[PDB]
Design a binder for this molecule. Structure first.
Ligand SMILES: [Zn+2]
Lengths: 119, 119, 101, 128, 226, 65, 220
RNA sequence: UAAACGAUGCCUACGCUGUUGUGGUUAUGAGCACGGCAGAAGAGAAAUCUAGUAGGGCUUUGGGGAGAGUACGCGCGCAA
């Protein structure tokens, strides 16, 4: 649930000279298995040649808009230096709801409606 | 534009089917009931839900809303049906009818006070 | 590829047909292919009938009408917006248009 | 004009596909009779009536559920007894069942009877 | 870790209760709409082989969007075969999808003898033809101990179906692996349904097993409710 | 076994794959026109059903009986 | 001949008042066998009574063949013909569908609340086309009431009757209900309860029901 | 010589339904010749269907793009 750890796992694997695809797929599994309800990963740079591009991946639920983004969403950014230039890495994770308030917010999102069962 | 939005109409529709007998023609009764039963986290939403529910309750009690089954009004419609029609085709035993039908009556030897249509 | 089953014209069981000339540009077009339009127009405009009622010498008067059949080539009919481009399923619908005035 | 033995075959093949049980066939010759009589011996067709109309001739026939297909060959090739198995393997679906019909000095016979009687002939048609 | 199966369909209730056999299913032409039904009887025995993997593309404003398409066969080397295709963002996901289609389209395949009925049946019964797109395949019976005279893709299919000798011929654009696979499976299938001379006398009649077991199912209705 | 189903109206086998095949069951009338425990049973292929031909064919066969 | 529960004079009379026999003007090669002459004044085709009774008896017979009657599904997606289904199904123990038949609701497991059919019943099958189409995926027979103008591929038992009038719809459903009950021994004679039931099924406007309410209350 | 085109050779077969024309004939129910239209089933790479089924008979005709329907010879034409 810490994006600053996972981004450094990614940065390591670039220096270990391992494909971005395999590295990112592993990161997403770790984030989801640890209980994150979704995440976003983007890699950008001179990644596969002289023409630069960025590759972005999305899994599960991610919030972008309003006050619910400030309480459920966590972000980190890093960069790795290689012989050809700098490659930039962005990671974002959406925290789980947690009734004891350790892993994420106590109260679920303001727009969710739940109707109680009948006796 | 004053349209209610999807969660507000959905919660409105579910509550009237789940608790129908508890509701009345009064906004303040209906606001008390949704304050009592529901999880809704802002007065801004429950003012809109109770608004739509008291907008339905008129149309529903006025001989029903199609797409909204209420057991209390299935019973009311059974009472209206149990108020049985006393009209009758049953006494219309004397009849006149066309020749082709009179020959079908002949070819199957059907007894009764039939006549050729005088027309 | 073949766009229409009838080749865009009404000729069947014939070799050849008479030509007619387009009202807008005088191009020759075969009679069985030309776009046709009917007109029935009063000699006197609607904005004058209330003056006619005080101008005429007769006890009552019926305004004379004028009658026309007009012919158009494809290019002119599309440009003047008598007809429009239509979707692959709409192309098959056939209905009689109004008489103009 | 169409060949009468070809006409016979298409008439019964189409009617079988359309799931009819009986047909009328409109122009008949001597070998057409003998062909139909062959299909009756092997139980491919059930009932045959011939109409003597003084205008060529016509037949009415009842089909069985066992008939999948039949056909005529044109032209009618001459074959030695050495040749018939080549045609058998070309026309029929299996080594176990079906009939290839051959005309001979001993009438119409099937590819098994050719071995029994020790005779070739001319190839006529098939059914299975 | 595993999930228990709750049968979604009426026939599904009968298999779990153990009131039916796989021959009875095929014999009455009943639909299969739950893959678990095939697992229940054959899970311990099914083999599979991937015939083709290929990449497909859709052009968009941003660029090509792309997916993996996989085609495979499920079969048991004795009697049963089925063919399935799936498309997904991932080669693993695609295999999971293809397997569902395959299981929902299993068929029993009949066999016969080239000559006399000595020993065990080993070839297709009758010469037959199967067509799919531009591709046509014809199968012919073969003497015992000839083996499978067959092209690259079709050879695997005959093996999984438990056929020992065949002769094959082919026409059309056989590079298209999906068409060649489907056409060859139709060829053997068509041979099994040929109207053999004995068939009319071999005929038997029975009431449908779903009507036959209605009483039990009505008890199960009330048991679920109570 | 897996290969013993035959269509009553078209006299050919029904393949395991045919989603449109169906089996029709009917009771037999009693003395004084009531019901009984015995059943008529018919197996019918999809090919007749796509055409529409089954309506007349069944009426024929109930008369045959 | 076909073994059919006997006609009785009041029943015969009943159907004729209910106008069951008035077909439309058109006819179809499938339905020629049920017509017996045409009205010289009106070009309306007239339905054969003796055949109508026969196929009504044949329908009843096969309804009896299926245990756990809940597995019979009766559908009729129209007002002007609604309430008939709602009562009819209760008289035999069947399940019913009333509104729009959600397409895929036999095919697809996710759509709740409709059972896998073992026999489907339809009235006025120009509407409910989807129902006839969809039953074909799940090996179910189909029984329909039909009229000379319309023709169907997958219907096994076509009961011929007027389907475009509220007098007529009531008559078919009311009679068939009784037969099915009779065949099982739930009732001893069919003429028992004519004007009661045939009226209950017959459709009525809100505007009529207001008038009838006021009348009834005055009488009470 | 023509996009001389429905870009679909000529005889002869076997083949589902509804509707609308033209000319004769009619037990007034319908037919025969020549058409248009809308579905179906099959077919086909599809679009669609003069294209369904098939070892029926006879003639013309194609064999990856180009160079080329061009060179040489020959036959017709006043020339083109
Ligand atoms: Zn112009």
């Amino acid at each position: 649930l810490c994006p600053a750890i996972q981004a450094e796992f990614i940065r390591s694997k670039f220096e270990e000279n391992i494909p971005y695809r395999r590295s990112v797929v592993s990161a997403i599994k770790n984030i989801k298995s640890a209980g994150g309800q979704g995440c976003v990963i983007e890699v950008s740079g001179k990644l596969k040649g002289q023409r630069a591009r960025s590759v972005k991946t999305i899994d599960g639920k991610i919030i972008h808009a309003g006050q619910p983004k400030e309480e459920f969403m966590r972000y980190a950014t890093t960069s790795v230096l290689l012989k050809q230039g700098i490659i930039g890495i962005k990671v974002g994770i959406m925290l789980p709801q947690d009734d004891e308030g350790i892993k994420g917010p106590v109260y679920d999102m303001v727009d969710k409606i739940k109707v109680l069962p009948i006796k | 534009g004053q349209i209610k939005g999807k969660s507000v109409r959905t919660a409105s529709k579910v509550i009237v089917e789940r608790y129908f007998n508890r509701l009345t023609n009064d906004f303040y009764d209906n606001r008390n009931v949704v304050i009592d039963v529901a999880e809704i986290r802002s007065k801004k939403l429950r003012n809109k839900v109770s608004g739509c529910v008291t907008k339905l309750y008129k149309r529903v009690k006025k001989n029903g809303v199609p797409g909204l089954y209420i057991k209390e009004h299935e019973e009311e419609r059974e009472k209206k049906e149990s108020f049985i029609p006393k009209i009758s085709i049953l006494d219309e035993d004397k009849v006149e009818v066309d020749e082709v039908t009179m020959e079908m009556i002949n070819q199957y030897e059907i007894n009764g006070d039939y006549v050729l249509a005088k027309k | 590829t073949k766009k229409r089953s009838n080749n865009g014209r009404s000729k069947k069981n014939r070799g050849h047909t008479r030509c007619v000339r387009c009202e807008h540009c005088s191009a020759m077009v075969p009679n069985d292919k030309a776009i046709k339009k009917f007109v029935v127009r009063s000699v006197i405009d609607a904005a004058s009938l209330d003056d006619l009622k005080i101008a005429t010498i007769y006890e009552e008067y019926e305004v004379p009408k004028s009658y026309y059949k007009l012919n158009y080539c494809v290019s002119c009919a599309v440009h003047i917006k008598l007809v429009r481009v239509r979707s692959r399923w709409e192309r098959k619908i056939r209905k009689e248009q109004r008489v103009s005035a | 004009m169409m060949d009468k033995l070809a006409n016979l075959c298409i008439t019964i093949n189409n009617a079988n596909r359309a799931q009819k049980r009986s047909v009328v066939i409109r122009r008949i010759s001597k070998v057409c009779r003998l062909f139909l009589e062959s299909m009756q011996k092997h139980g491919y067709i059930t009932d045959i009536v011939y109409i003597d109309d003084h205008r060529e001739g016509k037949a009415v026939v009842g089909l069985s559920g066992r008939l999948n297909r039949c056909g005529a060959i044109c032209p009618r090739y001459d074959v030695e007894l050495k040749d018939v198995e080549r045609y058998r393997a070309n026309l029929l679906p299996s080594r176990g069942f079906g009939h290839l019909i051959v005309t001979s000095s001993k009438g119409l016979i099937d590819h098994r009877e050719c071995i029994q009687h020790n005779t070739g002939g001319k190839i006529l048609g098939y059914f299975y | 870790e595993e999930a228990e199966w709750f049968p979604k369909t009426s026939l599904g209730k009968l298999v779990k209760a153990g009131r039916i056999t796989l021959d009875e299913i095929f014999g009455h032409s009943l639909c299969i709409r739950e893959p678990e039904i095939i697992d229940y009887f054959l899970k311990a025995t099914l083999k599979e082989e991937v015939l083709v993997i290929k990449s497909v593309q859709k052009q968009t404003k941003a660029g090509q969007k792309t997916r993996m398409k996989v085609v495979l066969a499920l079969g048991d080397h004795n009697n049963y075969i089925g063919i399935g295709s799936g498309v997904a963002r991932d080669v693993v996901s695609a295999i999971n999808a293809a397997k569902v289609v395959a299981k929902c389209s299993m068929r029993p395949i009949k066999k016969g003898f080239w000559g006399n009925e000595i020993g065990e049946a080993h070839t297709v019964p009758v010469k037959a033809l199967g067509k799919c797109g531009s591709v046509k395949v014809q199968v012919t019976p073969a003497p015992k101990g000839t083996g499978l005279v067959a092209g690259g893709v079709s050879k695997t299919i005959f093996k999984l179906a438990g056929i020992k000798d065949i002769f094959t011929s082919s026409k059309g654009q056989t590079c298209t692996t999906e068409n060649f696979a489907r056409a060859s499976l139709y060829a053997i299938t068509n041979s099994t349904n040929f109207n053999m001379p004995n068939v009319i006398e071999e005929k038997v009649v029975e009431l449908n097993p779903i009507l036959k077991n209605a009483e039990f199912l009505i008890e199960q209705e009330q048991r679920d409710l109570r | 076994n897996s290969f013993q189903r035959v269509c009553d109206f078209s006299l050919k086998p029904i393949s395991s794959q045919d989603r449109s095949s169906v089996q029709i069951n009917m009771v037999q009338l009693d003395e004084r026109g009531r019901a009984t425990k015995d059943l008529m049973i018919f197996n019918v292929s999809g090919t007749v059903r796509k055409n529409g031909k089954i309506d007349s064919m069944l009426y024929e066969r109930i008369n045959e009986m | 001949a076909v073994r059919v529960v006997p006609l009785s004079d009041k029943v015969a009379k009943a159907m004729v008042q209910c106008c069951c026999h008035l077909g439309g003007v058109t006819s179809s090669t499938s339905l020629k066998e049920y017509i017996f002459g045409k009205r010289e004044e009106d070009k309306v085709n007239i339905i054969d009574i003796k055949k109508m009774w026969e196929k009504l008896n044949l329908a009843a017979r096969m309804i009896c063949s299926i245990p756990n009657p809940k597995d019979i599904v009766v559908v009729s997606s129209k007002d002007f013909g609604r309430k008939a289904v709602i009562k009819f199904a209760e008289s035999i123990g069947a399940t019913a569908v009333t509104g729009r038949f959600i397409p895929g609701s036999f095919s697809n497991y996710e759509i709740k609340g409709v059972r896998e059919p073992r026999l489907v019943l339809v009235s006025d099958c120009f509407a409910d086309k989807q129902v006839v189409k969809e039953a074909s995926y799940v090996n179910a027979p189909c029984i329909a009431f039909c009229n000379t103008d319309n023709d169907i591929e997958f219907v096994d038992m076509v009961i011929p009757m007027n389907n475009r009038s509220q007098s007529a719809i009531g008559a078919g459903f009311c009679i068939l209900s009784k037969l099915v009950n009779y065949m099982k021994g739930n009732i001893d004679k069919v003429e028992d309860k004519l004007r009661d039931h045939i009226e209950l099924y017959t459709y009525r406007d809100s505007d009529e029901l207001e008038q009838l309410y006021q009348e009834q209350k005055i009488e009470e």
